[PDB]
Amino acid sequence: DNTTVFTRILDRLLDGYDNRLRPGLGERVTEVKTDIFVTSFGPVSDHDMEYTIDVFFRQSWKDERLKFKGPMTVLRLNNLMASKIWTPDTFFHNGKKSVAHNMTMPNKLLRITEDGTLLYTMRLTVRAECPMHLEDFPMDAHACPLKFGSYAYTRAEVVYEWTREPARSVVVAEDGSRLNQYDLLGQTVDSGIVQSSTGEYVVMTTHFHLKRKIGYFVIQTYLPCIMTVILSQVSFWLNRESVPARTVFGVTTVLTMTTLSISARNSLPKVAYATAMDWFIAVCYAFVF
Amino acid sequence: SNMSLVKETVDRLLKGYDIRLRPDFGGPPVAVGMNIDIASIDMVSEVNMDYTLTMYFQQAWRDKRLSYNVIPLNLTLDNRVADQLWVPDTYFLNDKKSFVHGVTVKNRMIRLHPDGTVLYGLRITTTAACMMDLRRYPLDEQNCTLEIESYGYTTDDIEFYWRGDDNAVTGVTKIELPQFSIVDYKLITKKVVFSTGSYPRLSLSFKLKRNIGYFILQTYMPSILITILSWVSFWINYDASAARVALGITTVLTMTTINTHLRETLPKIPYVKAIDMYLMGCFVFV
């Protein structure tokens, strides 16, 4: 009878429990201690000013109402029981479409320790907003965020606090960089307070710092443009009588630069201001003219 | 009769069954054996750094609670009973969007054996993330894996293995990709070590070797022949100024057109590749 006690504990655990009331309603401020392991920093979609991040999101609070005693010290809960307990309703302020994976079973886990400590692990992909300023395209560097916090619980009800020192509470896996275009440089985690029309909320931010690679635009736009300008200038070395020859240089080099500029600005998203590559293209076209 | 007899058999098995408890909760770990019948590998997208595969993913374990003697025949139960049993919390470590097909009913299998063995099958389309390195593109081999782990149970509670251990994965040799060709597949079982324990893991790794004849015919042949055509201007006599200018400058134009149309046809990979190096070489020669 080594499971009779286990099942008695599991059934008695949720007697007199109210999943509508946060732990310590009138007595404390619920302190959810967050922690994020970024398994892979997914692709940064330049067109949409978004970026995907696949994370293990661990939140640990204290529920005095689940203090049990028995032969076990740590007690696991299935998802059916995890839906019957109060859990922080964290969301991502800048998230667009986050997906929590449920294959083959919900990628969630909830543990309870004797003293009433709850640990909630989730695996989820967050497709968040990465507002970009491409004035230095393709030589731009971005610092775009992952801000998350609580919905419906102001700063006086639920206060998030990173588990260890802010910068050791968000970690990116070694092979987690799934970016083929940028170079994840570093990360700055911080905590702040946001004031809205509904109250004051705790917000846990994590800026990921990205630097764009240049080696592709170099050999794909810059060198073709430079060679086209050099070729246009080389027309001066031909003798003057060869009017058809020099005219053909002029016009066909204009056509090549037209094609190159069209292709480069096809590669760039459809921003409404001049980038560094755009200035280079403009000056090159002026040179050929 | 027989029909009722089995009705009471299954009802008795399920009455007083605690889904929250794994097989042999207080005892040795439960061993789960896995098969995969790869139905298809659909799309290997270099832009999204992912591939898609449809499989018949099967697991088999022992659940002494689900043991019966009063019938000999292998029981096969309606999939809706898989909700009332314990099934391992396996998850695919590198997937992005996965789903079990649900037409005409939820595509899964639950099959009990008289000795307690439980077989549990799903029909899954998983979009796995395949890290890629296309420096050598299009002359590159891409090792695309699928990693299977257990979320909550450690090796002290659950153990993973391939059922058969070398034939566990079938249907792979019959996969006909449009752009690649499976040259080998490996099965690797292991126990990975993390902070709070060691978790089991299996790994199905394909090596995809990209077919080259297309890329030859479409990208290299035009560029090589345009380089030769540019050379043609040398046999044209020095006086033929308009002729040699036409030839050379039009060859530059054609090389630019080829480059800027392959830039679109080819997957948008914003780092430098071997194909780009070759096109740059031909351009520099013109």
Partner: antibody, heavy 121, light 110 residues
């Protein structure tokens, strides 16, 4: 990786004491520096930690208002300053590096380099 | 706060086991690590994460954790293992707290 530490010190009760811990062989800012005391007659005790990157500190409960663990990134030293000395403060003060691993399933901490170094009152 | 035997003993060859017992907020939640201390010198790391072994410590040593208790099993006990053995486990009752055990003086009979 080593945590070469200051020489012995002798002082009379009530006089602030200084101990220093120069680290070499590892990026001094990546890992943390925990100070562990050890009285000759009894077992180990944890004085407190400090992150060499943020300066964040965690002095133990029994030394909440008696310690000052600062750190000098330039020369990669972390020197503790115990104050309000007493007769029970005589012990070998060790400098340890709190190596740490974090991954999917939580954290796990330990102290691999360790050091030496003493003080008597 | 962690409590372990004041001292243990074992004849050479015999497998002796030192144990630590603590509340659920340090060992029940975190991983222990064991620290040998040869007589008079500075303690060294012997086991971390309760199972892993630092490069240098022979496979002879092995640790385990069961619920709220930990055990260091010194198989094939030899003479040079005569030392103190402590166990540490970071506590979750405050953001930075690590609690050492009392320590165990292990002696080699003979």
């Amino acid at each position: 990786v080593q945590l070469v530490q200051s020489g012995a010190e002798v002082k009379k009760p009530g006089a602030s004491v200084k101990v220093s811990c120069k680290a070499s062989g590892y990026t001094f800012i990546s890992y943390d520096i925990n100070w562990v005391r050890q009285a000759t007659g009894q077992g180990l005790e944890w004085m407190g930690g400090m992150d060499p990157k943020s300066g964040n500190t965690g002095y133990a409960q029994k030394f909440q208002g008696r310690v000052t663990m600062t750190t000098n990134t330039a020369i990669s030293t972390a020197y503790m300053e115990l104050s309000s000395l007493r007769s029970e403060d005589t012990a070998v003060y060790y400098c340890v590096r709190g190596e740490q691993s974090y991954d999917r399933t939580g954290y796990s901490d330990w102290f691999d380099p360790w050091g030496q170094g003493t003080l008597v009152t | 706060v962690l409590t372990q035997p004041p001292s243990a003993s074992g004849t050479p060859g015999q497998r002796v086991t030192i144990s630590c017992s603590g509340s659920s907020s340090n060992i029940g939640s975190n991983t222990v690590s064991w620290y040998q201390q040869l007589p008079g010198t500075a303690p060294k790391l012997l086991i971390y994460s309760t199972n892993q072994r630092p490069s240098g410590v022979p496979d002879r040593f092995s640790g385990s954790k069961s619920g709220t208790s930990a055990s260091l099993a010194i198989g094939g006990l030899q003479s040079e293992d005569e030392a103190d053995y402590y166990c540490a486990a970071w506590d979750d009752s405050l953001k930075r707290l690590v609690v050492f055990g009392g320590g165990t003086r292990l002696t080699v009979l003979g």
